[PDB]
Every structure is written in structure tokens, then in C-alpha cells.
Design a binder for these strands. Structure first.
Ligand SMILES: Nc1nc2c(ncn2[C@H]2C[C@H](O)[C@@H](COP(=O)(O)OP(=O)(O)OP(=O)(O)O)O2)c(=O)[nH]1
Ligand code: SF4
Ligand SMILES: [Mg+2]
Ligand SMILES: [Mg+2]
Lengths: 868, 186
RNA sequence: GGAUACUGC
DNA sequence: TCACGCAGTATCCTGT
């Protein structure tokens, strides 16, 4: 009778079914001795509201204070007589609860005796500002059903749940294989200490064609790779896919080249050939229903894939669209909205993994296109099928099979990328730590995770959480640097988890600091008890520390090490966001005072540390909000380390939880400007020996808005400047290289790929009012004018600057690389690249180096040294 | 034209708007954006060449406790653009009195715009008194200002300051003011 | 004055 | 229905 199942996703519809939450997941069946999909419908999640009594009766805010003391009986009587009848509430259950509160609503005491009213969700909803004669405020009027369920039942992330006395379903309500109905929320509980079960995964890739007349994208091929036992707590399985299925549909006009029958016969029997897009979509829906994946992964799934899928299903009136999801519904969700919430609802109950979002969150790359992602992660080359050749490929069996295999290879690449980054296990870990739903975690963003973390933390500790919403302060301190070149060891001292440690040490929390609805609040007293925000922060920090210890294990696999590093980064970011949300205007926990205070304390700390270093008669040359660079003025590494230790201890002697550590020993340093420098980090191997690794921070060479050519040039220059060669020789070499570059440009020998400049779009192409002045936007517009996939906000665009005889400014002469390769009037504007890409960068890298000045550099490149 | 003589011109030929802008510039060695645009366009109109204007602005701003390289980094492009050297590369004409009156409205800390329109009557009276204008002339200028015909007020200023009974020209451009003053004097 | 980028923590 | 904070460097434009 007891139903034990692992829950993965939850879906609620606030408008159709009030008080119903649809949990989805896996259940164990002995008859098939396997795991099957299950859908449990929790019903009757009653609304709960909290009424705050007044200290003195007020005559409906007309006569003001009357002097009559108010007790819980008065509040209950007022609610039963006036409010209930007025707002059409039939039946409710009321009790008294002593609850604490510290947030941004004034006149609400720290700890008060609220009246808790529980009534069904079918009744109307009380207004937020409802004020009577005995109660001054109402909390929880617009709380969602899923939030109430998760917080009341203390459910945090995917886990094992036990249901007592489940009930069957009168009629089918889901496409799963097992169903159950819970008539109360108290019947669901969480059982700890059990392993996650395997979850099916389907990686899908689509290939379409734009029919010009309708300007609508038509699907011509789909490929999918399916794994039935993908783990959520172990390494990815090798190979990453078990089975596969491919479907290919003839266009509305073209016909097969009278050999597709033989081609498919001799190739394989797993390819399904259909004649009309309706049949293709129907077969895809049937296959999805049969396989029943818990995770569907793809590239641009939220943006293009699922949107086009739903659009084509609607256009073709393909029966049983709800198969795409897991719940059987009649009316399609409205097509539109921000991000992919409509797409998420269309696929309700199925986790969706867009490798673009996960790649943006986890790693950093110049471009997040599939080709670049495959190049940077899998280290492989992906061929590109031109958009204009897919239509023409319906002229030979070989070409059509090649197109289908290209789709298959794209699906395989997507699955491999998913496996490499550990997207799924990391998503599970983050979701468990925070407490949100997994789909929300995989949709990206940071606000929701911290929101749910603090929600759980406060609810567990008997608090009333706020109601969901319906350069503003000083930050860090950047010390003025002593720009130059340093040929001696530079000791970098960095604080460990600065802001989290500040929150812990000084006990900064909602319940500790006294805010007043733009001045820095005073530090909380030291006689209090640690709040909720500090404790949570501590937990996160400890997690990170443990991961770091794992990373420190000797003789560890490279790949695994990298994974651990990623994990560490994630956790760090989580903590930092737990700080940053405190100053997020649209956050559920906006506490700008607190955040300000945090930053202020950080500044103070840095100042003090600098002072101490100077009191030790050392030299301080840079610091960015938690760090100090010290010019050791020595060449004996051991001695440097000794000094490190010494100062380290000294600093630590002033703090309890804060700590400072040696973040690196630079053999040489080239400090150009605030947050722009390069160095040779010293990694010690033992016996006094050490290796050197080049490190760059903020230089144009590590920026994506400069032509690769220039970047490489600068890199070479840096390698020359940071070495130990005699300065004169260094300069000579630099000159030589620059001249080489000049020649390579003048003869046009440099590969075209090196002439590209990449830039991202913050808005859509149309919103920019400077379509002419902004080059990248121009290119985007051209792309959208062409007959291929459109470019939208967040999509990086690569462009080249060329010559056309227009005699316009460079900003107006941008062109797509393909365009340059196609048109017979466009040639690369050598001059520009030599004058505004290589020369600036190099000059800024050579500013503090004696013997090299702008003029000279220009000369070495063949430019005219007059206007420089 | 020489930079040094520019100050001299500010004594007589400069219309009151440019006089106010120049006084503020020499008092503080810095102008908000509107003042920069207006004064740069006017100095372009009088004839200050790109090299001359660059030198003047460099020398004036360097005294404001800013890095020398910062000027070439930031304001050089603006100075070039005023002379149609970059961007669309258009020989932008000097502001017309109609534009100045209907251009960006000055606020606290600003000194651009037409003083006759953007100065309170008491402030305009004080300024006119400061320039040793005869009491009758100051009263006449104030009366014209109250009539919303600020261009006529500037014409009266020109008549009084140049010791000419009638201006003889319809003042509709600050460069016209400077040209008429130069014609009368030189 | 404004607009467009992306580094640092 | 959404969306972490702030400090800092680099480039480019201002007609109807
Ligand atoms: N809100 C926010 N703050 C950040 C972020 N990254 C860094 N910070 C701030 C808060 C950190 O405490 C402070 C110090 O920067 P660090 O890179 O040295 O990180 P932290 O000291 O916390 O840890 P670590 O030195 O890597 O062990 O900078 C971020 O992504 N978001
Ligand atoms: S009327 Fe024209 S020239 Fe005279 S002060 Fe006003 S803006 Fe300057
Ligand atoms: Mg740190
Ligand atoms: Mg400014």
C-alpha cells in the first residue's frame, strides 16, 4: 500500500485546477523488475494565511486608537463575522501560532501571536492590503500551491517520497504507466538515505527548412539518442547512448531520387521514412510516448527546437500533442512569453536540458554555438550543412543519407557535451542544496535558488516569509596600482570566502541588523546568536571546502579533477549569489542595507590589511576588494614563502573566521591598469624547483571583442616581456614579430578565420536604434534578412570589416564572413586591422616597457608613424 | 587666429552666451556636455582650426587636475566630430539662436543656452549692471526680455555695447554677432 | 551628455 | 513570467 517513489519534477496550473500539484517520477515494479514513470496528484493543498493582531482596537481606521485590548478571540470573531461573509468563504479552520518575523514591512514585531486560517483553494483569494478592526496585516494571500506543499512537507529537491494509503484514478490523467492520487498533503513524507534511481535520457536534434511563402520553419529530419539507465550520482555511461531512432520526411514539393528505398534498405532498418510532415510529427510523438524520457536534452531546445515543434504540431493538427509532455491536456499553452516557460509547460513533467544555458552557467567560451562548444569541450571538428543545401539535397540518396547522419552526429555531440560537464549530477546537487525544482535549476538563473534556500531556512526555524513580489550602494575597494614591470617575486595574499566569512564573523543577518526604511547600518551586537543567513552561508562554505579537499587528493585523474573544479566554482557562485540577492531590486529578500554593510566591512578589512603590511615595512602595489600584492624585493623563493607565512599569521591574528592565504607567487609581473595585468605564476614541484605558468587577467588578449590575430600578437609580446632574456634582445624579437605580422597582412596570407570579431547581443536586433553605427547589430540584421535560423538576444555574432568602395566609416562596413567569401566586391580592410586592432593592443601592452612607444610599433607594422 | 587673443575677443565680440561659457570655463577649467558642445561649435564658427581648437581645449582642461592622456582618450573624438572629421563626417554648422533657445534646457551646474532666456530677470539685471551698461539700456533690455523677444534683447545689447544707434542686422546666429563685432572694430 | 561591448572582484 | 551585486576599461556618435 505504501507508495515509495523518486520524484523528479512538479507541475501546477494555478488557473485550471486549484490546489492540485502533479509530481512526476520513477517507481519500482517487480513484474518487469525495472523502473517505470509515475504521476502522483496531490490534492487539496489548502490556502494558509496569517493575520497579525493589533495592540489596540481601531474603529476601522476611522476613530483611530480606541483603547480596547485585542486577543486572538477578537481576531477570530472579526474574521468569522465580517471578512468571511464579505469575501464569500464558506468553511475554514483557524488556530493560533506564535511566529517570528524580520523583514521589510514596518510595524510588524519580531515575535507575535498570529492567527492562522486554513481554507480550501477553491474559495476566492483575500486581498493583500486587507485591514480590518483587530488585525493590521495579512500574510500569505498569494502563496502558490507548490510552494506551500514543498515548504510544509520539508521537501528539498528530488528525493524518495512515501505515500500512505494512495488511491487510484477514476479516469486516466497522465501518459505515464503508474498513477496515484493523494487526498491530503500530510500523507506524503520524505525518506532519507537512499540512492537515486536511473533516469531515461533522450538527446534530440532537428533539421528544418524555411518555406519562404509562409516564413515558417518546416521539419524535414529528426534524430534521437536514448539511454534507459543514465545515472544521477555516478559517472556518465560509456557509451553515452544505448539506442537511437531517426525519422525523415519528404518536403511538400520535392520527391525522393527514385533510390531512397534501396538506400534505406542497405543502410539500416532504424530510419523511418514518411511522406508528409504530419506523419513525421505523429511518429515522433508516438516514439516519445513509448520511450517516456525523464530528461530531454538538446541545443537551443527552449528557443528554436520545442517552439518549432509545437508550431508545426498546431499547424498540422497532429493529434495527441500532449504526448510531448506527461499530462493529458486539451488546450495548448499560449505560444510566446519570456524565455521558454510556454515551452516548459508544453513539456510539463519532463526535464528539459538546453546545453546552451548550462554551458553559459558552467564554463566560459568565446561563442556558445554548437560548433564552438564541440571544439572547446569535446575537442572535435563539426561539419556544417549550409541552410541552402538541405533543400537541394533531395536529389540523391547519398546526400539525403549524409544529411540524416549529420543530424545523428549533432545529437551525439549534444549528448557527449551533456555528459562531459556533468550537467545532470551537478543540477541535482545544486537543486538538493537549494530546494527548488530541477527544471527551474536547469533553466538557468540564480535568484530562484537563493530564494528557495532562504525560504526553507526560515520556514524550518518558525518564521513568516515575505510575500512573493507581484550602482545603488558602495562596493569593493580597488587600491591605486603602481603600474609598471616587476622582475622579482610578487606575493599575492587573498582572503578565503571574503563576504560569506564577513557575514559569519560579524553576524550580519535579517534578524541581527536593525534596518530602517541610504546609510550604512551599525554592526550587530556580539551577544546575539547566529542567525539563519550566516548558518546557511557556513554550510555552503563547508561544502566547498570539502570539495577542495577532494581536489587536493594526490594522483587524481585529470578529467575528474576538472569536474571537481567546476563543482567548486558552482558552489562559490551560489554563496556569492546568496550575498548579491540582498541587493537585488526584484528579489523576494531585498535588504539593501545589509548588503551595503557587507561591502563596507569588506572595504574596512582591506584598508586595515594594507595598513598592517605597510607597518611591516613591505610594499603594497595592488588590491581588488579582497587581495593584496606585495613586492617581496627578493629572489630566494624559500625566503619569500617564509615571509608569506609570517604576514599570513599576522593578519589571521586579528580575525576569528576570516582567513588569508597565498593565492600565488608571480616570478614576474606586468601591472598595466586597475584589473589588467599579467604574470608568471610559480607552481613549486619540490626540492626548490618550480615550474612557471603564464596567467593573464583583464588584458585585451583575453577578450572576445578583438580580432584573433591581434590577440595572438599580444600573447607573443607578453611571452617576450615576461621572460628572462636581456631587454634589448626582447625588444628586437618584438620588432621582428611585428614586421612579420605586417607582411602576413599585406600579402593576405593570414587565415580568414583570424580576421573575425565576435560580439554578443543584449537585446534583439531590432531594438537597437543605431542599426548603422553598431556593426555587430548590422550583421545580425543581415542574417535575419537571409533565409536561415534567426539570431536573437544573447546570440553571439561574428563579423569582419571589409572594403566596398562606400567610403564610409569602419563601423558601417561590417560584413559576415560567408558574405566576404561569396561577394566579388568585398576585400579585407588590411589597413583597419593593422591600425585599430593590432597597434592599440600592442601599445597598451608595451606602455610601461622602456624602448617601445606607439610610434615605433606603428613603424614596425608598415603604418605611417605621423598620426601616432 | 591665435589662442591668446581669444580671451580678448571675449571682452567685446562674444555674445553673452559665449561670454558666460568662457567665464565659467576659465573659472573652473571644466564644462558639462552642453557647454562643451556649444562652445566648441562657436569656436569652430569663429575660425579656430582643428589643431587650434585641440590645443586650446587641451591647455584649458589640463589645469583641471586630469591626466593629459585622458583628454586625447575622451574629448579628442568629440572635438574632431564637431569639425566633421569622424563618424558620419559631416561639417556640422554652428548652433543657430533658435536651436540654442530650443536646445537642451540647462539645469543646475550648467551654463549653456541663451542667457536672455535661461537667466531670471533679476540675474540678467545684475549681469547687465556688472558690464557697466547704462541704467536706461539695462531697463530697455529687461523690458525687451519681458516681451519674450530675446533676440531683440541681444540686438539691444549689441547696439549699446558697440556705441551704434541701430544694429543694422537681424541677429540670428552667434557667429553673426561675432562677425558684426569684428567688422565694426577691425 | 548618450550609446555598445566584457573583464575583474 | 523573468532577471545575483558593484568597480573598471575600451570604442563610438551628436542634421533635419
Ligand atoms: N555577487 C557576486 N559577488 C562576487 C562574485 N564574484 C566575486 N564576488 C565578490 C564576493 C567575494 O567574496 C569577493 C572576493 O572575490 P574572490 O574571487 O577572491 O572570491 P572569495 O574570496 O569569496 O573566495 P576564494 O578566494 O575563491 O576562495 O568578490 C559574483 O559572481 N557575484
Ligand atoms: S540671442 Fe543668441 S547670441 Fe544672443 S545671447 Fe541668446 S543665444 Fe547668444
Ligand atoms: Mg578571495
Ligand atoms: Mg563625463
Amino acid at each position: 500500500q505504501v507508495f515509495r517513489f523518486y520524484w523528479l519534477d512538479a507541475y501546477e496550473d494555478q488557473y485550471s485546477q486549484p490546489g492540485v500539484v502533479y509530481l512526476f517520477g520513477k517507481v519500482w515494479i517487480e513484474s518487469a523488475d525495472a523502473y517505470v514513470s509515475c504521476c502522483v496528484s496531490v490534492k487539496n493543498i489548502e490556502r494558509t494565511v496569517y493575520l497579525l493582531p493589533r495592540e489596540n482596537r481601531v474603529q476601522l481606521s476611522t476613530g483611530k486608537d480606541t483603547g480596547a485590548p485585542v486577543s486572538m478571540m477578537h481576531v477570530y470573531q472579526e474574521f468569522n463575522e465580517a471578512v468571511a461573509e464579505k469575501y464569500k468563504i464558506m468553511k475554514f479552520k483557524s488556530k493560533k501560532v506564535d511566529k517570528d518575523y524580520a523583514f521589510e514591512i514596518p510595524d510588524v514585531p519580531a515575535s507575535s501571536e498570529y492567527l492562522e486560517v486554513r481554507y480550501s483553494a477553491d474559495s476566492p483569494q483575500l486581498p493583500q492590503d486587507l485591514k480590518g478592526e483587530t488585525f493590521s496585516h495579512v500574510f500569505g494571500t498569494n502563496t502558490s500551491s507548490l510552494e506551500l506543499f514543498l515548504l510544509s512537507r520539508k521537501i528539498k529537491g528530488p528525493s524518495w517520497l512515501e505515500i500512505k494509503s494512495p488511491q487510484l484514478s477514476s479516469q486516466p490523467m497522465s501518459w505515464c504507466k503508474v498513477e496515484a492520487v493523494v487526498t491530503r498533503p500530510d500523507q506524503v513524507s520524505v525518506v532519507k538515505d537512499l540512492a537515486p534511481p536511473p533516469v531515461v535520457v533522450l538527446s534530440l536534434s532537428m533539421k528544418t527548412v524555411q518555406n519562404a511563402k509562409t516564413h515558417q520553419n518546416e521539419i524535414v529530419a529528426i534524430a534521437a539518442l536514448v539511454h534507459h539507465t543514465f545515472p544521477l550520482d555516478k559517472a556518465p555511461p560509456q557509451p553515452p547512448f544505448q539506442t537511437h531512432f531517426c525519422v525523415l520526411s519528404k518536403l511538400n514539393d520535392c520527391i525522393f531520387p527514385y533510390d531512397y528505398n534501396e538506400a534505406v534498405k542497405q543502410k539500416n532498418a532504424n530510419i523511418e521514412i514518411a511522406l508528409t510532415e504530419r506523419t513525421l510529427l505523429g511518429f515522433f510523438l508516438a516514439k516519445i510516448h513509448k520511450i517516456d524520457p525523464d530528461v530531454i536534452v538538446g541545443h537551443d531546445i527552449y528557443g528554436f527546437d520545442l517552439e518549432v515543434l509545437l508550431q508545426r504540431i498546431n499547424s498540422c493538427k497532429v493529434p495527441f500533442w500532449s504526448k510531448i509532455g506527461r499530462l493529458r491536456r486539451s488546450v495548448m499553452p499560449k505560444l510566446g512569453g519570456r524565455s521558454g516557460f510556454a515551452e516548459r509547460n508544453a513539456a510539463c513533467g519532463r526535464i528539459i536540458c538546453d546545453i546552451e544555458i548550462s554551458a553559459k552557467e558552467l564554463i566560459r567560451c568565446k561563442s556558445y554555438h554548437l560548433s564552438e562548444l564541440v571544439h572547446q569541450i569535446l575537442k572535435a571538428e563539426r561539419v556544417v550543412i549550409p541552410p541552402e543545401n538541405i533543400r537541394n539535397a533531395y536529389n540523391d540518396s547519398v546526400h539525403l543519407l549524409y544529411m540524416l547522419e549529420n543530424t545523428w552526429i549533432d545529437a551525439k555531440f549534444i549528448l557527449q557535451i551533456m555528459c562531459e560537464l556533468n550537467v545532470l549530477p551537478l543540477a541535482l546537487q545544486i537543486t538538493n542544496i537549494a530546494g527548488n525544482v530541477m527544471s527551474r535549476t536547469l533553466m538557468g538563473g540564480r535568484s530562484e535558488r537563493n530564494e528557495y534556500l532562504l525560504l526553507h531556512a526560515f520556514t524550518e526555524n518558525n518564521f513568516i516569509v515575505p510575500d512573493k513580489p507581484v550602482a545603488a550602494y558602495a562596493g569593493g575597494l580597488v587600491l591605486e596600482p603602481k603600474v609598471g614591470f616587476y622582475d622579482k617575486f610578487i606575493l599575492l595574499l587573498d582572503f578565503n570566502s571574503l563576504y560569506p566569512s564577513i557575514i559569519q564573523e560579524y553576524n550580519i543577518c535579517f534578524t541581527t541588523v536593525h534596518r530602517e526604511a541610504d546609510e550604512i547600518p551599525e554592526l550587530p551586537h556580539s551577544d546575539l546568536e547566529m542567525g539563519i543567513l550566516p548558518r546557511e552561508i557556513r554550510k555552503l562554505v563547508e561544502r566547498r571546502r570539502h570539495v577542495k579537499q577532494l581536489m587536493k587528493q594526490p594522483d587524481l585523474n585529470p578529467d575528474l579533477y576538472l569536474q571537481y573544479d567546476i563543482r567548486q566554482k558552482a558552489l562559490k557562485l551560489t554563496a556569492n549569489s546568496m550575498y548579491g540577492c540582498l541587493g537585488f531590486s526584484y528579489s523576494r529578500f531585498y535588504a539593501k542595507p545589509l548588503a551595503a554593510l557587507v561591502t563596507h566591512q569588506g572595504r574596512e578589512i582591506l584598508l586595515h590589511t594594507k595598513e598592517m603590511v605597510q607597518k611591516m615595512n613591505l610594499e603594497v602595489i595592488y588590491g581588488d576588494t579582497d587581495s593584496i600584492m606585495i613586492n617581496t624585493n627578493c629572489n630566494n623563493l624559500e625566503e619569500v614563502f617564509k615571509l608569506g607565512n609570517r604576514v599570513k599569521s599576522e593578519i589571521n591574528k586579528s580575525y576569528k573566521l576570516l582567513e588569508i592565504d597565498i593565492d600565488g607567487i608571480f616570478k614576474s609581473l606586468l601591472l598595466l591598469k586597475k584589473k589588467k595585468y599579467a604574470a608568471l605564476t610559480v607552481e613549486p614541484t619540490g626540492d626548490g624547483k618550480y615550474v612557471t605558468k603564464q596567467e593573464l587577467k583583464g588584458l585585451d588578449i583575453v577578450r572576445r571583442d578583438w580580432c584573433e590575430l591581434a590577440k595572438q600578437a599580444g600573447n607573443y609580446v607578453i611571452s617576450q616581456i615576461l621572460s628572462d632574456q636581456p631587454r634589448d634582445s626582447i625588444v628586437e624579437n618584438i620588432q621582428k614579430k611585428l614586421t612579420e605580422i605586417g607582411e602576413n597582412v599585406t600579402n593576405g596570407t593570414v587565415p580568414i578565420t583570424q580576421y573575425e570579431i565576435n560580439k554578443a547581443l543584449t537585446k534583439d536586433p531590432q531594438d537597437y536604434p543605431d542599426k548603422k553605427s553598431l556593426p555587430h547589430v548590422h550583421v545580425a540584421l543581415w542574417i535575419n534578412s537571409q533565409g536561415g535560423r534567426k539570431v536573437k538576444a544573447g546570440d553571439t555574432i561574428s563579423y569582419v570589416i571589409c572594403q566596398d568602395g562606400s567610403n564610409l566609416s569602419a563601423s558601417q562596413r561590417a560584413y559576415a564572413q560567408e558574405q566576404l567569401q561569396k561577394q566579388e566586391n568585398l576585400s579585407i580592410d588590411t589597413q583597419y586591422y593593422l591600425s585599430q586592432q593590432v597597434h592599440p593592443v600592442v601599445a597598451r601592452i608595451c606602455e610601461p616597457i622602456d624602448g617601445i612607444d606607439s610610434a615605433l610599433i606603428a613603424m614596425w607594422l608598415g603604418l605611417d608613424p605621423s598620426q601616432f | 587666429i591665435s589662442l591668446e587673443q581669444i580671451d580678448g575677443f571675449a571682452a567685446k565680440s562674444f555674445p553673452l552666451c559665449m561670454r558666460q561659457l568662457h567665464k565659467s570655463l576659465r573659472e573652473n577649467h571644466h564644462l558639462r556636455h552642453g557647454g562643451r558642445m556649444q562652445y566648441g561649435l562657436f569656436l569652430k564658427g569663429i575660425g579656430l582650426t582643428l589643431e587650434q581648437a585641440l590645443q586650446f581645449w587641451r591647455l584649458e582642461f589640463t589645469k583641471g587636475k586630469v591626466d593629459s592622456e585622458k583628454f586625447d582618450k575622451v574629448y579628442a573624438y568629440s572635438i574632431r566630430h564637431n569639425y566633421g572629421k569622424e563618424g558620419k563626417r559631416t561639417d556640422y554648422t554652428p548652433y543657430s539662436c533658435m536651436k540654442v533657445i530650443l536646445s537642451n534646457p540647462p539645469s543646475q551646474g550648467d551654463y549653456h543656452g541663451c542667457p536672455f532666456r535661461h537667466s531670471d530677470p533679476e540675474l540678467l539685471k545684475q549681469k547687465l549692471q556688472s558690464f557697466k551698461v547704462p541704467s536706461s539700456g539695462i531697463n530697455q533690455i529687461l523690458e525687451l526680455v519681458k516681451g519674450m523677444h530675446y533676440q531683440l534683447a541681444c540686438q539691444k545689447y549689441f547696439e549699446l555695447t558697440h556705441s551704434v544707434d541701430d544694429c543694422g542686422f537681424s541677429l540670428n546666429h552667434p557667429n553673426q554677432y561675432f562677425a558684426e563685432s569684428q567688422k565694426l572694430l577691425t
